[PDB]
Design a binder for these strands. Structure first.
Lengths: 120, 259, 255, 56
RNA sequence: UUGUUGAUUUUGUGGGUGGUGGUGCAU
């Protein structure tokens, strides 16, 4: 089980309990409120200051939140559930997500343990 | 208790809502959703005494501003009871035009609608007249497929009642792209009325609305079921088919291909 | 009766004025509250109270996401019986025929008459080719028998539902296709008359589908060719006339 | 239209510290992360619809 | 897209629908 595969289920589990903040504006609102438990950020964001802002908010001394890097925004959006499913079952009309923040895990899974263990 | 100066002011507001028909709503009224204790402020405004025009505008105001959870409470406590109150107390047991719109504006938030009117109503002794009026509101307004399918799945698992059978027919009439899980939930609901060990649903008399609902399901979703499900549904017509609707159901079901 | 009517009118005016006075009072009452709005809110803000989902609710949020995962069925309208379909067809055959006989008799659809026209007449991935040349370049490397495949593929790639503006492209393509059908006939085909026959009729069939929805585009192009034919006949006489010209008149008869 | 409105609302220095140039909403119900729409004469809350002074 | 909000809408192309419709009739 890879770390990326661990995040794929974890984001899906967070979706089931409405525990994800999807997008920058929702992500920063979560981070400023202290509601963020994990931040998933895309490394390939065209605008650098987006990376600087999320990294700064995630690294704030009062509320340190773990941060993860994702190669492509499109796959992060798919994990966030933005994309729709086609008759073949493949994700279609998917929307890219630059940043996704988890407000509630929902269910305690073994895959959550690896992610926090990796951070620890 | 709220501040005493506030109480008089919102008591004054409540008087306006009694006779308010048009114009601008009081600015104090418009800012209630932002307040944490909107319920307490809402009670002093006497929601039962709100005019039908106020109920329409208040629902616009609160559904848009309040959160999904808080909207559900505003939904469940005020507009649902007013909906039931108006039908019961009206001479012809009809619903006011403004209240009728107020249900539509609540549909803009599908989740808070379903958990605040539909499921509470059908689970709290909904009558045939109530289901017809609510079903008409459901039929005309566009609802998302995802929320509708979840709503359809909930109703199908509930104990059979003619009022619930209506809503099942409305959702099936909506001609949605039901997920196959919902299609199986639909098929599961219709099998349980066959005689086999089985519950009373096998021997319970089935009104026309169920047959129309069962004819309703077959017309679109004949191509979205497996052969085994098709064979099971065919047995339902043989055992529990209607005199005139039943042959039609068998024709539609046989005409469908397997998924 | 008159005294009854006057009493009715006075009562209606009385109630109308009473309603108007009530409205006047309501507006003033609204104004006063807007004036004390700040004081009332400030007291509410100070008294603001300090900072689990139902199991019934907990299930629903799970459903929508599971439904989000599960594939979605397509809906199908009720199947009409053979008698109704046969019944439905025959009136349309009749209606077109009763419309047909009217147009035989002078009913012109702007339902005016021909006599109206007779007033003052004597007294005075896949690319959609917008032009005929563009289509040839796309089909330049393709064999003669392969033209229907590419032409069909262009229609599928640019259906109206796929994107906005596809209707004009296909309509322009309708004009383009007609010129190609006429163009091929001008080209020598004695070598592979069979292959030409299998492309030529197929392209006409596609135009028949295109004409059914892109008439105005086709009719405009058809009129343009007629003017061009007349202009060429003006200078070349019979030399202007060609096989595709004969074909062109035949296709108009089809469509 | 507004594009990357989050970019302007939050400013980052070279050090990376995050600074807020737009005041938070005073209403506890709105919570943190809510910024007031800024105008010369007064400062306005979109969610609550309250009006605050720029000086405050 | 809502009125700040978050996918509930908007756009283009197709497209089913008379129905909080009445009136009498047969336990």
């Amino acid at each position: 089980v890879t770390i990326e595969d661990a995040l794929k289920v974890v984001l899906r589990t967070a979706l089931v309990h409405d525990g994800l903040a999807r997008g920058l504006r929702e992500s920063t609102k979560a981070l400023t409120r202290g509601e963020a438990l994990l931040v998933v950020l895309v490394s390939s964001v065209t605008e650098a200051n987006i990376i600087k802002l999320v990294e700064g908010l995630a690294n704030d001394p009062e509320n340190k939140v773990p941060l993860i890097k994702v190669a492509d925004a499109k796959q992060l959006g798919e994990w966030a559930g933005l994309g729709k499913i086609d008759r073949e079952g493949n994700a279609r009309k998917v929307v890219g997500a630059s940043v996704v923040v988890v407000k509630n895990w929902g269910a305690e899974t073994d895959e959550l343990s690896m992610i926090m263990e990796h951070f620890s | 208790a709220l501040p005493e100066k506030v109480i008089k002011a919102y008591t004054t507001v409540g008087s306006i809502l009694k006779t308010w028909t048009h114009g601008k709503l009081p600015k104090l009224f418009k800012v209630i959703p932002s307040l944490r204790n909107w319920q307490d402020v809402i009670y002093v405004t006497n929601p039962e005494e709100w005019s039908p025009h106020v109920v329409y505008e208040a629902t616009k105001l609160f559904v848009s501003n309040l959160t999904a959870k808080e909207s559900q409470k505003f939904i469940n406590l005020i507009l649902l009871e007013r909906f039931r109150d108006n039908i019961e107390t009206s001479e012809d047991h009809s619903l006011n035009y403004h209240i009728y719109r107020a249900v539509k504006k609540s549909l803009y938030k599908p989740s808070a609608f379903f958990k605040g009117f539909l499921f509470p109503l059908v689970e709290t002794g909904c009558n045939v007249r109530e289901a017809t009026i609510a079903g008409s509101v459901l039929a005309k307004v566009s609802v998302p497929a995802l929320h509708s399918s979840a709503a359809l799945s909930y109703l199908l698992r509930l104990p059979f009642s003619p009022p619930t059978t209506v809503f099942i027919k409305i959702l099936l009439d909506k001609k949605y792209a039901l997920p196959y899980q919902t299609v199986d939930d639909c098929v599961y609901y219709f099998m349980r009325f066959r005689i086999l060990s089985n519950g009373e649903d096998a021997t319970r008399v089935l009104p026309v609305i169920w047959h129309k609902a069962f004819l309703t399901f077959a017309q679109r979703y004949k191509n979205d079921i497996t052969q085994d499900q098709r064979d099971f549904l065919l047995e339902t017509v043989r055992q529990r088919g209607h005199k005139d609707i039943g042959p039609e159901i068998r024709r539609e079901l046989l005409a469908g291909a397997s998924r | 009766k008159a005294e009854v009517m006057k009493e009715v009118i006075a009562k209606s005016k009385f109630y109308k004025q009473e309603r108007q006075k009530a409205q006047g009072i309501m507006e003033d009452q609204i104004d006063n509250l807007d004036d004390n709005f700040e004081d009332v809110m400030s007291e509410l803000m100070m008294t603001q109270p300090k900072k689990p989902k139902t199991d019934l609710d907990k299930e629903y949020d799970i459903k929508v996401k599971e439904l989000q995962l599960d594939k979605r069925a397509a809906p199908s309208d009720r199947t009409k019986t053979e008698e109704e379909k046969n019944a439905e067809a025959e009136e349309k055959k009749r209606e077109l025929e009763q419309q047909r006989l009217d147009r035989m008799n002078g009913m012109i659809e702007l339902e005016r008459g021909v006599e109206d026209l007779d007033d003052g007449f004597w007294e005075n991935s896949i690319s959609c080719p917008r032009t005929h040349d563009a289509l040839l370049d796309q089909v330049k490397k393709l064999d003669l028998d392969d033209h229907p495949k590419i032409v069909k593929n262009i229609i599928k790639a640019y259906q109206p539902k796929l994107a906005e503006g596809n209707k004009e492209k296909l309509g322009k393509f309708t004009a383009v296709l007609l010129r190609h059908i006429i163009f091929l006939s001008n080209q020598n085909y004695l070598k592979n008359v069979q292959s030409f026959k299998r492309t030529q009729n197929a392209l006409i069939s596609i135009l028949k589908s295109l004409s059914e929805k892109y008439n105005r585009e086709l009719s405009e192009e058809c009129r343009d060719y007629i003017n061009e034919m007349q202009a060429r006949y003006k200078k070349n006489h019979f030399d202007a006339l060609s096989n595709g010209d004969l074909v062109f008149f035949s296709i108009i008869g089809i469509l | 239209k507004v594009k990357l409105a989050v970019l302007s609302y939050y400013k980052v220095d070279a050090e990376g510290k995050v600074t807020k140039l737009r005041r938070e909403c005073s209403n506890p119900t709105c919570g943190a992360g809510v910024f007031l729409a800024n105008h010369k004469d007064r400062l306005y809350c979109g969610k609550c619809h309250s009006v605050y002074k720029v000086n405050a």
